[PDB]
Design a protein around this ligand. Structure first.
Ligand SMILES: *[C]C1=C([C])[C]=C2N=[C@@]3(C(=[C])[C]/[C]=N/C4=C5[N][C]=NC5=N[C]=N4)C(=O)[N]C(=O)N=C3N([C][C]([O])[C]([O])[C]([O])[C]OP([O])(=O)OP([O])(=O)O[C][C]3O[C](N4[C]=NC5=C4N=[C]N=C5[N])[C]([O])[C]3[O])C2=[C]1
Ligand SMILES: *[C@@H]1O[C@H](CO)[C@@H](O[C@@H]2O[C@H](CO)[C@@H](O)[C@H](O)[C@H]2NC(C)=O)[C@H](O)[C@H]1NC(C)=O
Ligand SMILES: *[C@@H]1O[C@H](CO)[C@@H](O[C@H]2O[C@H](CO)[C@@H](O)[C@H](O)[C@H]2NC(C)=O)[C@H](O)[C@H]1NC(C)=O
Ligand SMILES: *[C@H]1O[C@H](CO)[C@@H](O[C@@H]2O[C@H](CO)[C@@H](O)[C@H](O)[C@H]2NC(C)=O)[C@H](O)[C@H]1NC(C)=O
Ligand SMILES: *[C@@H]1O[C@H](CO)[C@@H](O)[C@H](O)[C@H]1NC(C)=O
Ligand SMILES: *[C@H]1O[C@H](CO)[C@@H](O)[C@H](O)[C@H]1NC(C)=O
Length: 496
């Protein structure tokens, strides 16, 4: 038997079983794994989500796992529901009204539906002169999706990840109950869901912190051939003072074998800049080149320009990049934030965007980053042609709430390391997959206490080590409380 509300969804054509629907929700950005669901839900309101979850919660023996598809940027099927039901979250925002993004009257925050993509949260905020403080490198991701992970970019060192910039949320648990939570209300759910990997319920609304919107961003890249100087400078720029003046700080690694090509593909350096950097590497006999990427946000004041120059000159004076290797660009704030969109459009036309992405994302404690550099950037990765950015930058643990579900190293400073490999060449995917296991194996043998991010483990003992035994027990407790049937986001392979 079907509950009245569940059957109603079928009549209205919200529950689709046709191969067209199920196929679209069977693949993700990773383009490595795939799994067909039994059906796809195209909800028009949060009421439809309650109906589905209430049904599953009340129906004994309910055999349908449920996942919430934001924009499917998952890499290894985290948004699939094998033989289950996939919720097409975007459907919540098709109705021209009411709005799914509402900037508060006082301009202190912005309410956004869990299905909304950050690029739109940004446009709706800028219209009101404000903007979120913490981002992801790419804006075409959903609010609920990044919040289910962490959401990190070059601003996290001073504002923490996106999960540290949420005032409250509306969540529908695995029991089908609508609950509003925050640090002062149903905190248990609030903490569990943030970085919760969609295991406790679906986020329908998230209240995101905002700050006055800067007009422009002075964007710079500094070049190094010495990793010690590179990492020391990133740490200096992101160290607590209160923080330095930089609004964003990330870094990049360029292996020698594909140096000229990777520098050109940054979309930042001119061919003249590239030639100078390639010559520098040859002079130093470097097998790797490093670049710090940073910005300084500022407004359209009359003195702003001159002030930014002074501020930058001052900051750069405290650094140790190679003399004369500082490169600047000045752009509108929104242009900087949406910089990766340009990369997608480009690569997609060449058929180089929708290809396998055996990405490796991890947090490495500061005390072992130099060892990681030697073993990976100067070791394992040498002798290969790399297409895709190799991003590395420090984060401050003080901005992360360990009470939340996100797991991080124990050190005060740890690095986000994102090796965004693209299997652009033919079946070059097997090589890349084996290479990532080799990197992980190298870290295990060297005793590096890293934490994987954006990855799902197919073995229980691995998830326990990921969270940590005590934190794991907590995760399980919260699981037996909000989704005892183990139906939500089975693609994480945690309880499924
Ligand atoms: C695809 C992608 C891209 C493209 C990007 C990104 N980004 C990031 C990273 C990793 C990095 C990268 N970078 C880059 C760069 N730079 C320069 N250049 C370049 N290129 C490229 N790239 C950032 O930045 N950061 C971070 O943190 N991250 C990221 N990412 C990742 C993301 O975030 C993820 O994927 C998430 O997931 C989100 O997404 P979405 O789509 O939204 O979602 P999905 O997949 O669909 O799903 C997931 C999960 O969750 C859950 N859910 C959803 N929704 C919801 C939920 N729950 C609850 N509630 C709600 N609402 C599901 O179920 C699953 O499980 C990237 C990517
Ligand atoms: C320039 O750098 C290269 C690579 O870092 C150096 O070549 C390595 O030299 C060591 C010691 O002789 C060998 O064990 C490696 O096998 C060499 N690299 C490879 C794999 O080709 C080179 O010595 C440096 N130039 C000098 C002499 O200063
Ligand atoms: C960096 O990579 C290049 C390959 O792009 C290496 O190749 C250079 O040296 C080779 C050995 O003598 C020559 O056969 C190549 O023609 C020459 N190519 C270049 C860069 O012009 C280079 O040796 C590598 N350097 C290091 C430090 O490993
Ligand atoms: C942001 O504010 C708008 C305006 O109040 C909200 O719109 C209401 O949405 C509910 C259901 O979500 C409807 O029942 C009301 O009729 C809507 N109000 C109007 C225009 O009559 C919206 O839900 C809020 N969303 C956010 C960003 O949290
Ligand atoms: C990978 O993407 C290609 C191109 O869109 C598609 O034909 C193929 O089915 C995808 N494979 C997986 C595992 O999703
Ligand atoms: C400041 O002026 C610039 C250039 O005219 C414009 O792009 C920007 O949006 C303005 N900022 C404000 C006050 O919205």
């Amino acid at each position: 038997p079907w509950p009245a509300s569940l059957a109603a969804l079928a009549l209205d054509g919200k529950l689709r079983t046709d191969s067209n629907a199920t196929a679209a929700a069977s693949t993700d950005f990773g383009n490595i794994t795939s799994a067909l669901p039994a059906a796809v839900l195209y909800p028009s309101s949060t009421a439809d989500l309650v109906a589905l979850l209430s049904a599953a919660n009340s129906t004994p023996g309910w055999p349908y796992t449920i996942a919430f598809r934001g924009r499917g940027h998952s890499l290894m099927g985290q948004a699939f529901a094998p033989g289950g039901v996939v919720v097409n979250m975007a459907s919540l925002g098709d109705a021209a009204a009411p709005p799914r993004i509402n900037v508060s009257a006082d301009g202190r925050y912005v309410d956004a539906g869990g299905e909304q993509v950050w690029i739109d949260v940004l446009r709706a905020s800028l219209a009101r002169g404000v903007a979120p403080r913490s981002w992801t490198d790419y804006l075409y991701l959903t609010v609920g999706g990044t919040l289910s992970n962490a959401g990190i970019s070059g601003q996290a060192f001073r504002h923490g990840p996106q999960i540290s910039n949420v005032l409250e949320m509306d969540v529908i648990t695995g029991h089908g109950e609508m609950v509003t939570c925050s640090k002062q209300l149903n905190a248990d759910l609030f903490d569990a869901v943030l970085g919760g990997l969609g295991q406790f319920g679906v986020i329908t609304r998230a209240r995101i912190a905002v700050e006055p919107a800067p007009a422009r961003a002075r964007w710079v890249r500094l070049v190094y051939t010495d990793f010690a100087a590179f990492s020391a400078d990133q740490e200096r720029l992101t160290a607590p003072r209160s923080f330095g003046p930089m609004s964003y700080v990330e870094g990049s690694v360029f292996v020698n074998q594909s140096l000229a090509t990777d520098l050109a593909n940054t979309g930042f350096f001119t061919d003249a800049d590239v030639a100078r950097i390639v010559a520098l590497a040859g002079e130093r006999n470097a097998t790797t080149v490093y670049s710090i990427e940073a910005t300084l946000n500022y407004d359209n004041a009359t003195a702003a320009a001159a002030a930014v120059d002074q501020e930058l000159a001052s900051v750069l004076g405290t650094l140790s990049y190679v003399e004369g290797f500082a490169f600047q660009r000045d752009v509108a704030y929104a242009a900087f934030l949406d910089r990766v969109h340009g990369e997608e459009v480009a690569l997609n036309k060449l058929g180089l965007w929708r290809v396998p992405h055996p990405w490796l994302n991890m947090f490495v404690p500061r005390s072992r980053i130099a060892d990681f550099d030697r073993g990976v950037f100067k070791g394992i990765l040498q002798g290969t042609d790399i297409v895709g950015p190799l991003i590395v930058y420090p984060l401050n643990k003080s901005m992360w709430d360990d009470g939340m579900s996100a797991a991080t190293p124990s050190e005060d400073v740890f690095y986000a390391v994102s090796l965004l490999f693209s299997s652009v060449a033919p079946n070059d995917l097997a090589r890349l997959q084996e290479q990532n296991r080799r990197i992980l194996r190298f870290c295990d043998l060297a005793g590096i206490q890293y934490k994987t991010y954006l990855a799902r483990h197919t073995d229980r003992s691995d998830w326990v080590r990921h969270f940590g035994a005590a934190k794991w027990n907590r995760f399980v407790e919260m699981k037996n409380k909000y989704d005892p049937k183990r139906l939500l986001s089975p693609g994480q392979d945690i309880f499924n």
